[PDB]
């Protein structure tokens, strides 16, 4: 039915309005919020525009998913911190809502080109529920330190998307697809999202950091981790390709893995050289993932990841959690070992289980899923101009 998507959008918006009227009541962090806002809507949205015939869907469904996501994440994250009661809205609520949107967009990275906007609304709602519950668990029951959210955002979104894409596996797409290819100006546009994410990631890891030494440490550690990550990602992209050529997928994504793997240790006293070590390891791991693990996941494990969000968010997020555990080992933080490890395990497991359930729901032929031949094509859901 062509009316399923407008119906679900209108019903979800009405539900959001009712929930806000039921639960919601009414400045130094606003620039950091705006940096996170730019990341969420430009960086992720245009980072995904590398596909030659899916740029409209990439950026537009990014905007739609994140716009629904900030409202639904606001509601869910408040009702948990309020324990079912009315809560007020400040800048921190907005920042956390954009964080929930980030998690959903990371999972959307795994299913880009093979899902409908209706499936995107459904996965937004369900994934935000699961993400907010796991994040509340980590932040309040385990009380682990995840200020940059290598575990609660990046690893969670990556493995949620991987579970969804595994459930939504198509046999006809395992050997590749004709539309699953980048263009020249498409990669030029994807560099916009890459650059904005790289520039504003220090605000991502320091927005809700405790003011004082912790926020400054988050900023400096993120900056130097990204600085080392760019060099290592360039070096390993040249290393893994024929004749030392650079791969635009690597430069677009693996250059940002340092901001993911430093998130747990962002506010910890890990020193700029330790942050640079983490960023270099993250860049190398991301490039190696793109070169070797993604074909093995697509062909053998039957998990297709369109944007390679495993190599950017999951493996660097797991590396960030392990780095948090090691930093706890050598006195860089006063948080417990077992709580960090439990946060990592709970994030990964909750992501996998929620992704399994959400993908099973998304597999019902009611959401206008595209055919195998029509994957990675804007014309299934958009009016496309005649010329590029």
């Amino acid at each position: 039915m062509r009316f399923t998507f407008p119906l679900m959008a209108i019903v979800l918006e009405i539900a959001m309005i009712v929930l806000f009227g039921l639960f919601v009541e009414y400045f130094e962090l606003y620039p950091l919020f705006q940096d996170v806002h730019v990341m969420i809507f430009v960086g992720f949205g245009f980072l995904m525009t590398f596909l030659k015939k899916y740029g409209f869907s990439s950026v537009g469904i990014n905007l739609l998913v994140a716009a629904l996501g900030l409202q639904w994440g606001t509601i869910v994250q408040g009702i948990l911190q309020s324990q079912g009661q009315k809560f007020n809205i400040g800048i921190k609520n907005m920042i956390n809502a954009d964080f929930s949107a980030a998690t959903v967009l990371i999972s959307f990275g795994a299913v880009l080109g093979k899902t409908s906007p209706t499936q995107m609304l459904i996965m937004t709602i369900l994934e935000i529920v699961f993400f907010a519950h796991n994040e509340y668990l980590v932040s309040e029951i385990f009380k682990a330190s995840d200020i940059g959210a290598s575990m609660t955002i990046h690893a969670f979104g990556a493995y949620f998307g991987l579970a969804v894409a595994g459930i939504l596996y198509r046999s006809g797409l395992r050997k590749g697809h004709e539309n699953e290819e980048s263009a020249y100006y498409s990669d030029l546009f994807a560099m916009i999202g890459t650059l904005f994410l790289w520039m504003f990631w220090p605000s991502f890891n320091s927005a809700i950091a405790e003011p004082g030494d912790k926020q400054c440490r988050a900023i400096v550690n993120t900056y130097f981790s990204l600085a080392a990550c760019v060099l290592t990602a360039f070096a390993f992209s040249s290393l893994v390709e024929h004749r030392g050529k650079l791969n635009m997928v690597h430069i677009q994504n693996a250059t940002l893995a340092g901001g993911v793997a430093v998130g747990t240790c962002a506010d910890m006293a890990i020193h700029p050289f330790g942050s640079m070590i983490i960023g270099s390891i993250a860049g190398m791991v991301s490039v190696l993932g793109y070169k070797f693990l993604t074909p093995l996941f697509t062909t053998k494990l039957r998990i297709h990841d369109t944007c390679g969000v495993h190599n950017l968010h999951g493996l660097p997020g797991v590396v960030g959690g392990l780095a948090g555990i090691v930093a706890v080992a050598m006195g860089a933080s006063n948080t417990s070992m077992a709580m960090q490890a439990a946060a990592l395990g709970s994030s990964i497991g909750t992501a996998v289980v929620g992704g399994l359930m959400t993908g099973l729901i998304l597999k019902l032929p009611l959401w206008g899923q595209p055919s195998d031949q029509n994957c990675y094509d804007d014309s299934v859901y958009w009016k496309v101009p005649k010329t590029r």
Binding site: M8, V11, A15, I79, G84, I125, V129
Partner: protein, 33 residues
Amino acid sequence: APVVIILIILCVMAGIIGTILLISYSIRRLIKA
């Protein structure tokens, strides 16, 4: 308890969209034949 709100809220959304689709979907089955 706030977990039950997200569940009750999720249950209300799931019940609404499902019922609406079920009605139009059924009427399609009554109408095409």
